[PDB]
C-alpha cells in the first residue's frame, strides 16, 4: 500500500485574531485587492454572531474593497454561481471570501473557477474539462462540519435539470482558512452533538479496514477518536469551553488529514445506508451515523475480530467487542441521542425500499464486508 | 496558544513506483522539462544502491532531458551554489531533482532560489532580501533525516568568510518529495540507531511544554513517539522489513508536521547542550541525544511532573517517573547505544567550555526549565 498527500490550504487556527482575515487576503490576492464577500442567505446568521462586522473590521482595517453576493442555501445551486462569475469578472474581483459553513465554500470554488475560465464552469462538473486554475478563495468556518475548507472538492446541483455533481481538483483547495473554536459556542446542541458523530464516524469508516501494515496510522486514528470520545461529552455540557471546542475543532480538521489515514481503504457501507435514511426521513446524518455505525460494526465483528479488539482496546480500554460496542452506544447517549430507529418514529415500513436504493445497481455495498441487500435489512433491523 | 499550519509538498509515499520521478518532475515544470540531477560527491552511493540508475530510467522514460552536477559535501557550501545557479541560467534548467540528503537538499533549495534571482543568492540567507519565487525541485530521500525534504529551510556555508547561515521561506518548500522505505535497508546500524533517535527527540522537544490546553496534540505526539519506541527497537533486528521501516519512515516525516505539533512551545535545551558536546568530540547527534535527553529530563523533573507522568504512562505504561527513564534508557540501549559519556572516552575536562559555548552571550538557556551554566554542568555530570 503506497499512498500520495499534497493539500495546501493554509490554517489560521485560533480566536482574537480577526486582522489575519485581510492580512490574508493580501497575501494571497493579485496586486491591489478587491474581493467578493460570500454568505448564505443575507448574512442573516453571521450577523447575528458578530461575524459580518469583525470580517467588515478586518477588511477596512486593510483598505480592501468588497462586494457582497449572498443566499447560497444548503444545496447550493449553479443558478448563482452563474451570477458570482459574472461579478467577478464585470467588478473585476481578485478573490472571494466565504464566511460560512461548506455550502458556502463549495459555492464559493465554484465561482473562483469560473471567473477564470473562458468557457461554462459546469463542464467542470460534469466531467468535460479539467480546470487548471481558480481565481482564490479563504475561507472563515461558522461550523466544523465535513472539512470543505479544507478539501479538493465542490459540490452543486443544477435545479435546471435536477442533477447535482461534483468537482475534485487540486486548485480547489483554498489559499487559507480561519478556524476560531469560538463559532462552536453558538451551534444548536443536536446539531454540535451530530458534528461530533460525523467527526468520529469519518475517523471509523478509515479505521476498520482490511489493509495491513498500518501501525502508525492506526495509532494516530485512535488518538484522534479518543479525543473525541473524551471531549465531545464534555464540550456537550460546557458549550462556551474554549479548550474543549479546540480540541474537538482541531480533531475535525485532523480528521479530514490523509497523514493520519495513509492510503488504508475506507469503507462507506454506514454512510450509504444512513444516506437512505435520510432521503426518505427527516433525520441529521450525524445522529443517523450513531445509530447505524454500532449495528454495522456488531453485524461485520466477525471479519477481522482481531481489528475490532484493537479498536475498542485503544479506545474503549476493553478487548470484549460486545461491551466495547456497549461503550460507545453509551458514549452517543452522552451527547443527547436516542440510538433506536424506532425512537424518531423511523418504522421498518422502508428498510427494504432503503436497501435497494443504497445498492443502486450494483449486487453488494462495502469493501470491510460485502454487504448485500438483505445483509443491509439484517444492519437495519439491528438499529430498529 | 493560536497557530498557523501551511506545508504545500506533495509525498509520494512507497516502493516499486520509480516513474513518479518523471511523473512528478512534468506535473511540476516550465512547459518542456529540462532537469539538474544533484547528488553528493560523483553519486557514488547512491548509484552504488541502484537509485542513480532506476533515477535515469524514469527520467529516460517521460524524454526528461536532464545535466548533473555533484560534489555537494556534508556542509554544502556557496562555492557549489553558485556554480549551480550559473547552469540553471545558461543551460536554462526548468526543474531540480536532489537525489540525496539534506545536505543536497539544501544545496538543491539555494540553487532553486538563485536560478530565478537577478542578484546573490546570499542576499537570502544574511537576511537582506526576502526571496518571493524560486524554480522548483524535487527531492529522492535516501535516508528518513532531518525532514528538509519537507521544511522551509536551506543551511548554506559561506567557506570564504567562515560564516555559516538559513534562509527560511515558503518558497524553499519542494514541490514533491519521493518517499521509499527501501533506502532505510543500506544504511549502517549506528546510523539507523541515531536517526531513530533524533525522531523521538524532535517529538520529545516539543512534547514536554508548558503550554497548557493541548490535549490532542499530546496524543497525537504520544502515537508517534509510541511507534518509534514499539517498531525502532525491531528495525535494528530485521533491518530489510518494509513495514517496520515504513512506520518508522513515517514517524519522521509526522515527526517533521507542525499538526501534530499545534503551536505548543519547543524546547532546544537538550539539542544546544548536545551541539557543543559534537562540536568538540567526533559524535553522531542522534547518539548524543540519547544520553543527554534522558539526563535532562531527570534535571527537569520537578518543573511540571504532571507532564512527565502523563508521558512515561502513555509511552512506557508508567506513571512512576524513575521506572520511565529507565525503560527510555533501556530502550536507546536495545538500538545498541551506550547511555554514558565516560564510554565514548568523552571526559568531564570540557564541561565548563562547553556550557559556556551553550550559553554563548545569555545567562540562561532553555524554555521548560531555564537553565545556567551550573545546571548544564549538573546535566553533563547527570550524563558523564
Ligand atoms: N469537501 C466537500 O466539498 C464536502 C464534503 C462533505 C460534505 N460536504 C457538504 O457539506 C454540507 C454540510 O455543511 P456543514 O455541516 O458545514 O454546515 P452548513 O453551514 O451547511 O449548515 C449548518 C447548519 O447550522 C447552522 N450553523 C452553521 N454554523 C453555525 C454556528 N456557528 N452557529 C450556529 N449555527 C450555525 C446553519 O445555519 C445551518 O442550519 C453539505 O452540503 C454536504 O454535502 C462537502
Ligand atoms: N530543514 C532543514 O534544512 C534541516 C533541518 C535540520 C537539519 N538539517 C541538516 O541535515 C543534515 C543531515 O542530513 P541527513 O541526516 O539527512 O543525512 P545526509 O544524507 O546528509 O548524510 C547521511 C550519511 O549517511 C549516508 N547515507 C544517506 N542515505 C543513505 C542510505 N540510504 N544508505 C546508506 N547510507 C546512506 C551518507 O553517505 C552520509 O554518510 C545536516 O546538514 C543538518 O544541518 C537541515
Ligand atoms: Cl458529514
Ligand atoms: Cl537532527
Ligand atoms: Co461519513
Ligand atoms: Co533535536
Given at each position: 500500500?503506497?499512498?500520495?498527500?499534497?493539500?495546501?490550504?493554509?490554517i489560521?487556527?485560533?480566536?482574537?485574531?480577526?486582522?489575519?482575515?485581510?492580512?490574508?487576503?493580501?497575501?494571497?490576492?493579485?496586486?491591489?485587492?478587491?474581493?467578493?464577500?460570500?454568505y448564505?442567505?443575507?448574512?442573516?446568521?453571521?450577523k447575528?454572531?458578530?461575524?459580518?462586522?469583525?470580517?467588515?473590521s478586518?477588511?477596512?482595517?486593510?483598505?480592501?474593497?468588497?462586494?457582497?453576493?449572498?443566499?447560497?442555501?444548503?444545496?447550493?445551486?449553479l443558478?448563482?454561481?452563474?451570477?458570482?462569475?459574472?461579478?467577478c469578472?464585470?467588478?473585476?474581483?481578485?478573490?472571494?471570501?466565504?464566511?460560512?459553513?461548506?455550502?458556502?465554500?463549495?459555492?464559493?470554488k465554484?465561482?473562483?473557477?469560473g471567473?477564470?475560465?473562458?468557457?461554462?464552469?459546469?463542464?467542470?462538473?460534469?466531467?468535460?474539462?479539467?480546470?487548471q486554475?481558480?481565481?482564490?478563495?479563504?475561507?472563515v468556518?461558522?461550523?466544523?462540519?465535513?472539512?470543505?475548507?479544507?478539501?479538493?472538492?465542490?459540490?452543486?446541483?443544477?435545479?435546471?435539470?435536477?442533477?447535482?455533481?461534483?468537482?475534485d481538483?487540486?486548485?480547489?483547495?483554498?489559499?487559507?482558512?480561519?478556524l476560531?473554536?469560538?463559532?462552536?459556542?453558538?451551534?444548536?446542541?443536536?446539531?454540535?452533538a451530530?458534528?461530533?458523530?460525523?467527526?468520529?464516524?469519518?475517523?471509523?469508516?478509515?479505521?476498520?479496514?482490511?489493509?495491513?501494515?498500518?501501525?502508525?496510522?492506526?495509532?494516530?486514528?485512535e488518538?484522534?477518536?479518543?479525543?473525541?470520545?473524551?471531549?465531545?461529552?464534555?464540550?456537550?455540557?460546557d458549550?462556551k469551553?474554549?479548550?474543549?471546542c479546540?480540541?474537538?475543532m482541531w480533531?475535525?480538521?485532523?480528521?479530514?488529514?490523509?497523514?493520519?489515514?495513509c492510503?488504508?481503504?475506507?469503507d462507506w457501507?454506514?454512510?450509504?445506508?444512513?444516506?437512505?435514511?435520510?432521503?426518505?426521513?427527516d433525520?441529521?446524518?450525524?445522529?443517523?451515523?450513531?445509530?447505524?455505525?454500532?449495528?454495522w460494526m456488531?453485524?461485520?465483528?466477525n471479519?477481522?475480530?482481531?481489528?475490532?479488539?484493537?479498536?475498542?482496546?485503544?479506545?474503549?480500554?476493553?478487548?470484549?467487542?460486545?461491551?466495547?460496542?456497549?461503550?460507545?452506544?453509551?458514549?452517543?447517549?452522552?451527547?443527547?441521542?436516542?440510538?433506536?430507529?424506532?425512537?424518531?418514529?423511523?418504522?421498518?415500513?422502508?428498510?427494504?425500499?432503503?436497501?435497494?436504493?443504497?445498492?443502486?445497481?450494483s449486487?453488494?455495498?462495502?469493501?470491510?464486508?460485502?454487504?448485500?441487500?438483505?445483509?443491509?435489512?439484517?444492519?437495519?433491523?439491528?438499529?430498529?
Amino acid at each position: 500500500d503506497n499512498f500520495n498527500y499534497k493539500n495546501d490550504t493554509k490554517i489560521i487556527f485560533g480566536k482574537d485574531n480577526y486582522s489575519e482575515i485581510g492580512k490574508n487576503i493580501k497575501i494571497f490576492s493579485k496586486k491591489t485587492p478587491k474581493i467578493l464577500l460570500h454568505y448564505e442567505a443575507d448574512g442573516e446568521l453571521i450577523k447575528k454572531l458578530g461575524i459580518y462586522e469583525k470580517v467588515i473590521s478586518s477588511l477596512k482595517e486593510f483598505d480592501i474593497e468588497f462586494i457582497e453576493l449572498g443566499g447560497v442555501v444548503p444545496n447550493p445551486r449553479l443558478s448563482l454561481v452563474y451570477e458570482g462569475i459574472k461579478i467577478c469578472k464585470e467588478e473585476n474581483i481578485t478573490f472571494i471570501l466565504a464566511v460560512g459553513g461548506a455550502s458556502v465554500i463549495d459555492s464559493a470554488k465554484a465561482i473562483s473557477l469560473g471567473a477564470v475560465d473562458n468557457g461554462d464552469v459546469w463542464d467542470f462538473f460534469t466531467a468535460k474539462r479539467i480546470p487548471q486554475d481558480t481565481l482564490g478563495i479563504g475561507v472563515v468556518l461558522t461550523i466544523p462540519g465535513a472539512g470543505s475548507e479544507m478539501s479538493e472538492s465542490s459540490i452543486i446541483t443544477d435545479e435546471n435539470k435536477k442533477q447535482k455533481a461534483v468537482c475534485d481538483t487540486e486548485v480547489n483547495f483554498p489559499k487559507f482558512a480561519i478556524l476560531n473554536p469560538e463559532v462552536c459556542y453558538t451551534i444548536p446542541d443536536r446539531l454540535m452533538a451530530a458534528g461530533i458523530v460525523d467527526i468520529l464516524s469519518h475517523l471509523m469508516e478509515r479505521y476498520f479496514t482490511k489493509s495491513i501494515d498500518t501501525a502508525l496510522s492506526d495509532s494516530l486514528i485512535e488518538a484522534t477518536m479518543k479525543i473525541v470520545i473524551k471531549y465531545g461529552p464534555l464540550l456537550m455540557k460546557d458549550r462556551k469551553n474554549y479548550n474543549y471546542c479546540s480540541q474537538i475543532m482541531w480533531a475535525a480538521t485532523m480528521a479530514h488529514n490523509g497523514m493520519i489515514a495513509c492510503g488504508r481503504v475506507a469503507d462507506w457501507a454506514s454512510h450509504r445506508i444512513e444516506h437512505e435514511i435520510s432521503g426518505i426521513y427527516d433525520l441529521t446524518h450525524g445522529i443517523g451515523m450513531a445509530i447505524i455505525f454500532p449495528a454495522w460494526m456488531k453485524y461485520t465483528k466477525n471479519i477481522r475480530p482481531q481489528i475490532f479488539e484493537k479498536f475498542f482496546k485503544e479506545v474503549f480500554n476493553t478487548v470484549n467487542i460486545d461491551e466495547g460496542i456497549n461503550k460507545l452506544e453509551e458514549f452517543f447517549k452522552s451527547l443527547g441521542i436516542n440510538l433506536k430507529l424506532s425512537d424518531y418514529g423511523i418504522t421498518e415500513e422502508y428498510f427494504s425500499l432503503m436497501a435497494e436504493k443504497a445498492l443502486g445497481n450494483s449486487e453488494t455495498l462495502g469493501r470491510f464486508m460485502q454487504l448485500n441487500k438483505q445483509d443491509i435489512i439484517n444492519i437495519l433491523n439491528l438499529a430498529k
